[model samples]
Target chain A: YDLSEAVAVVTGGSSGIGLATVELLLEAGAAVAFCARDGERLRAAESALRQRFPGARLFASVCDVLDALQVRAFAEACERTLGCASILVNNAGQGRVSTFAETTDEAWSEELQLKFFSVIHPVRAFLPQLESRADAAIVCVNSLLASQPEPHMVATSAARAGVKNLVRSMAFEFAPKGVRVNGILIGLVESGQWRRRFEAREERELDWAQWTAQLARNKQIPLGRLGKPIEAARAILFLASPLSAYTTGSHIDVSGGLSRHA
Target chain B: YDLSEAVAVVTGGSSGIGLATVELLLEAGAAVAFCARDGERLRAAESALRQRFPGARLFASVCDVLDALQVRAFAEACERTLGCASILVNNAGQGRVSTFAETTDEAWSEELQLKFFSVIHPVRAFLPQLESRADAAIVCVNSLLASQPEPHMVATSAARAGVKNLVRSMAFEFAPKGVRVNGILIGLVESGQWRRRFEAREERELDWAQWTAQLARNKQIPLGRLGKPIEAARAILFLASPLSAYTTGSHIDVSGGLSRHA
Candidate 1:
């Protein structure tokens, strides 16, 4: 990306794809402001980054994204430290596998508010600042669940669908501002959720490799292996960086070819 | 479509694309439970439908979809009047022209509830009934905005993009349950909105034909003309019927090359 002067904002930056993106951005010469709900994880993440890259300018905030005020505060703080942000990476939210009856329709509706706005709040806070800047971009980390909502996910499934809708809307609405917006659809990536799921594996005496293999077979993913965080970070790097200046209102699926659409 | 036993639920059925969808479903031998916020329009639509097909079982309700309780009532009434419902056509929305500076990002929050629920409520109401049926599907009327959101049509543009995301998510979530979900992406479709826009050509003294010619020149749509509602309904018919049994979580763009995505 060679983002020597680009100031980027990444939500849910404690671990998984968000952490990996921060790692990549720092390596690529961009100043980064990362947000997460946990203070412990935020501290650890910042420490890890500062240790690896001595010259990288990194800022961390322990804030719940469900609240707009917190998002605004984070945005203002980033301006104080890293100057106006040019890129926004909304990577917050979660999903699980469950049937419709298992999770009522009302439940999905209730959950969509916070999970969905994790993206919108940041966009609202930073869009004004981004409007005046050149090379502005917004990259939302959505999931394959947003398209083909898995039968197993509860409230998370419907909310992701809503997120996709929000992303698409913003892409067009903001296109004329010269601030591009895009999405990265993830599938079967080895993140905190998968790590926990692996830890909870008790169906048989299987190691992490064996458990993941079984899950992949059952899920029918094409690439036959789980995706690494770095794999997803590369996609985000292009969209966040100027490599995809001509690209907007589109999504890159990093799903090991598990997704049926582009 | 030998949909002799099918019961379909169509939202915003009073006019335009919704009315056209109702016509196709009834002609194909499927019963309809259509709800519209406009009471007078609802009655007129119901009367017209009854007159056209004397034997078609049709029910109309004056209900505002923005209200969740009313949406639930419509669902319950459909179950009681038409037996268990299996088909859903979500075509409730409005579009306008505006620039990005004219619309704020956060205002979409107030707008998304009605637009997003226009799709979700029908799915919530009919999905349970559709799950057990041998042939069942959900079809959403989306637009090119899903891929390339326009800067001018602020509110409607963003919401349309979001709807595509929601539709895709549900398609995958419901696929395993034996129900398919798909979308029709519209581009310059001739509908109530276009008709109104055509009539509002105050700058020149031109007939409908002349106005359309001017519009075609201004908007360089690849089709060189507006799409008919019947064209949209045919795609909806395929997705909602067994003809597209192998399809789900996909979108058929009737946009005539207006969209940048395939």
Candidate 2:
């Protein structure tokens, strides 16, 4: 649980699971470097964190993970400011909802590139630094769709499946190098996407909590409620921390029992 | 558990999980049509089942699942003899052990085609019969390696991953047609592969039970032993039967706690 000397790097840190992970890592006393594609959100996230943890070391960058060069530059900048990172969390990609017929070749390519390359670029950029340190770890934030793919979101599901495969492959390939790699496959959670949906809700008979609860029921989530960002962040923290020293090439599902496979 | 009117089609049913599933479905009163590449083994399995069930409807075919035309022929033959299949179990593929570096492009292509096409061909060939039936089910037997890949077996792991994704996708795609598709992701189990290894044991100090227990411990399976074929077959039964009427686009991992994601 004590990661006072750890320098953790996270992607898509401006909001949702990424932001929650950044906050949790900082709370555990680790210096954090996180990035998002938006400058405004990145700045706001950083400013808020700085106020909460006055003396904590922090680095924020506006970098698109899809761009390898940008990812490399962010890695370099983060190292210059926060020292070589001992932890890397790939959490950038978002899911797209589309049926197989509706998803064109371009759509497939874009999703594959976004989800696959986003993790690939960051791992390639930060691997050297991760390898340089002891007890180094890489945790990729993934989706349960990787295992239980949905036909409605065929492209995203397939893309996520590929990345999950890549993450496990990397776990073994990096094991001998003393770097542990794992992933978190999550289900429905309250995040930016849900927030946007709530804001645009045409049926406002129920408030946020009630609406999300009803949605969870309709989806048949056994937990009967949506997961909070911190719920997923806790799993990320477990995998990222030395608490899971012997756990590599493994994944924890923060799915509120929605993931039928166990 | 009565499936007296149900006709079940299974691939690789001469031995291992496919054989076990065929036996279970027949025991549940379903007419079973099963196939394997080895005609001798297929006949032996069918003969044994006939002796045990005593008048149960059974059909056996010598067919390689990788051949689309062969799968189609098996499907047509099964329907003609046993009536239209209401349950299809795709369980033809096996794992190949090879490190990422040791695996060649041909190996990758072969593994992918073997796993992916085995499922594709059977589902394609059986979809018409399945759709015509009420409460039809397709249960794909997969490996836990899909979600938790091992570096030593990258190709098989990735291929299994793709099949798992395809299974879930099919679940959603076929749901509207009143067909339920699901999967069983298994861990170390006593199957043909393990039996072969046991028969070829270099160190014979320990018996089969002791050796497998040690192997399970070595692999860190929390259940402390290798899974029995019947154990996995039970899960296949659950998903294939109407007991899981509302559970489609889902998977049950009979991994004996080896699957870390839940």
Candidate 3:
């Protein structure tokens, strides 16, 4: 739980699990450097954090992880401003519903690159800094769909699976170098994505909680409603901290017991 | 079961599950181009098979699949000798036990390359041919340790995990190209490795069957014994053949329900 000496780097930290993680790490006395693609949102997030936690060390930047140069520059800035990154949390990516027959070749190439290599770019960017640190760790925010595929989100499912294996190989690759690598297998974690969608399509005079409950019933989530961003953020903090020191190349499922395998 | 027009290219098909797959595919009425590292052994396997199935179309070759030139050359020979490969079985690899701290840098790199990139090399080698064919498949022989890793075989474990995701990504990537890809998550499958070891270390005046049962009990496999290579082979054939036309980006667990998920 003590990350007092930790300097953590997170992707997609403007909101959702990434934003929650930044808050949690700061509370645990860690300096944070986080990035997102949108500069306006990134600036807004910086103000939100600075207003609430005036004493915390936070560096918010705008960077497109898919572009290698941007990722490299962002990492350099994080290192120069905060310190050498002791932890990396890769959380920038998305999935869409499309069948094998419906998806185009260009879409296939773009989706895999966005979902899979986004994980790769960050690792390559900050690995040297992480290797030099004593208690370095990398936590990739992956999906349970990596193992249990949803055929509709075909490309994303496969890319998620790719990300899973990439993490595994990197974990062992980085082991001797003194960095521990692991993953958070996400399920239906509620964040702004769904919330924004809900607002756009509001119906039946149902409140947010009521709408989510109805949505959960239809979705058939095993543990009921979607997980809180903070709930997953807490698990992310544990994976990065000394609490999971012996752990490497492991995935902690925060899926409300939806996964069907052992 | 009918694979009369299918041609399979299996790596490490000299023995074990890979060899078993070659036999099963032949029985299912398919031509096979299988490669092993040892020339004499590959020739010997060819002779042994010809003795039983005199009319079977089988091409055996010597190629170190780890070497890119040899793999590429082997694929070329297979195209000319056995016809364009409609099936690619990536089973050429080995795993060993060692702690992360004890393993050398060279050892770590070698293990990951053997397990992960070995899968990649073959796909890159035969992908063009597979794309040109109908009802094509790429089946990778992976380990249950891919998901449930062992700390002792740390590097192999991570590589296996990497292989799994790589397969998932490739499965979806190739799906639209009419090539279905899947993985067999192997648990404790009894093969030449165990068979040879059993003969060298017989104990308690026990028969081989009795000894294996005792060993099985000691290991505590969920199915109460190691899986037969033929059992795994059957699943591989199902995955590669037209029987599984609708299946892609999925895994057939030959691990006897040992996976701890659900």
Candidate 4:
């Protein structure tokens, strides 16, 4: 669990699970660099981290992960700021809800490029840095849709499935290099994004707390509630930390028993 | 457990797992219509079935599963001859080992068109007929490579994974309509195909049994032996039978414990 002198990078680190994982890494005594496409959000996240963890080393950057060059630059900057990163968390993708027949080619490409390639691009860029470290890890944040693909979210499901397989392949190739690559198939979580959706949707009738509770109940989450960000953060930390040293190419389901298939 | 008035159709039913399944189904008193592209092999299989299970209703046809029209016609003929098909075992595809870089576009396309779409086309053609039955089932025979991809067999892995997902999607869509769809991920089964390969490559400095044992050992199959086609046939029978009454969209791995991930 000790990560003193370790360096970690979390993509989509401005908010939600990514930001929560960055905070957890900092708390574990790792020097952390977090990136997102929004500059203001990144700066605000940095300020929040500083206020909470004044002694921890936190580096925040704004990088568009869809662009390969930006991903490369982000990795390079993290290396310069935090020394070689020991852990890379490819956790930056959101699912867009749409039926298959309603989907456009642009939507499909965007999903494949952003959600799938975003994971691959960072892995390609950071592997060299990770290899140089004595102990290293790569964690791809996939979704339950990766395995339990739904018709409404066909694009995301297909792309995330690809990402999961890519993680498996990379695990086989990189495990010999003393680097572990794994994935977390996450289900619904109560994050900032969920809050925004609830606030914006005119059809959402319930109050914030009620809406979330009802949603969780309807989804049949065994915990009877949406997952907290730290619940997911702890899993990322476990995979990146020495606690899960022997585990690689494995996917942990953080779905609160929502997944139908075992 | 009993299939006494049940009618079934099996693709690639002349040999391998398909023929074994056909034998099991007829033994259980079910009428079966089995199809393979090889007319001679189909006739041999039919004669063998008739000899083993006298008075059992059986129909054999030569049909290419890759052709949608042929699959449709075959389904209709099976319905006319054997009564309604209460079980459809889409067990027709096999892997041709080739490295990713060495695999041609033609190879990849052929694998998908034959291995993946063969399952899809048959389902599309037979689903309507199956709908008339009180309890109908579709069982797709997938591979362990669907989950664990090898660089040498990327095409099979990819195509099988696609078929696996399609089964899952269809299971969800059709489960409520009394049609249960499931898949079995078969591992290294010591079948005619493996035997032929070992015989063809006899210069590897090992006896046939030794070579087969070595192959299983190399894959780290926990059972320390390759699976028998009969074992796979039993599993498919279970899935296609009323025994799995409530089960749908499930993938049972019959790998002799070859798969590392659960």
Best by lDDT: 2
Residues A37-150 of candidate 3 have per-residue lDDT tens digits of 889988988888888888999888889988878999999999999889999998835677776545554565577567755676788789889999988999999888888776
The sequence of per-residue lDDT tens digits that candidate 4 reaches over residues B1-262 is 7898799989887778888899899889998988888899899888878899998998889999877789889998988887788888988467878754355546745665677556766777888878889779999998888888876676567567656766777787677668999989898887778888898875678987788888888878888888888888999999999898989988888999878874
For every candidate, what is the interface RMSD in angstroms? Answer: 4.0, 3.1, 6.1, 3.9
Q: How far is candidate 3 from the true structure (C-alpha RMSD, Å)?
A: 7.6
Which lDDT tens digits does candidate 4 get at residues A1-262? 7898799889887778888898888888999988888999889889988999989988888998877789889898888877998899988477878754355546755665576556756777888899999779999887888888886776577567656766776787788679998989888988777988788867666888788777889878887888888888888889988889899989899988878975
- In the range B1-262, model 3's lDDT, one tens digit per residue, is 8888998999988777887888888898899998888888788888888887899998888888778788899999999987889999988356778754455545655675577556766787898899999999999988887776665776566557656766776786787789999988888788767877688874958776877777778867667878898888888888998899899877888877778876
Q: Report the C-alpha lDDT of model 2 over B102-149, residue by residue, as the tens digit.
A: 765457557766776677678878989999998799998898998788
The lDDT per prediction is 0.80, 0.85, 0.81, 0.81
TM-score, each model?
A: 0.83, 0.61, 0.64, 0.69
lDDT tens per residue, model 1, A171-199: 77787778999988888788778878888
Clashing residue pairs, backbone N/CA/C < 3 A, model 2: none
> Where does candidate 2 stray beyond 4 Å?
A1-156, A178-262
Q: How well is candidate 2 docked (DockQ)?
A: 0.27
TM-score of 4: 0.69
- DockQ of all predictions against the true structure, Cα-based: 0.29, 0.27, 0.11, 0.14
- How do these models rank on TM-score, best leading? 1, 4, 3, 2
Give chain B TM-scores in order: 0.93, 0.97, 0.95, 0.95
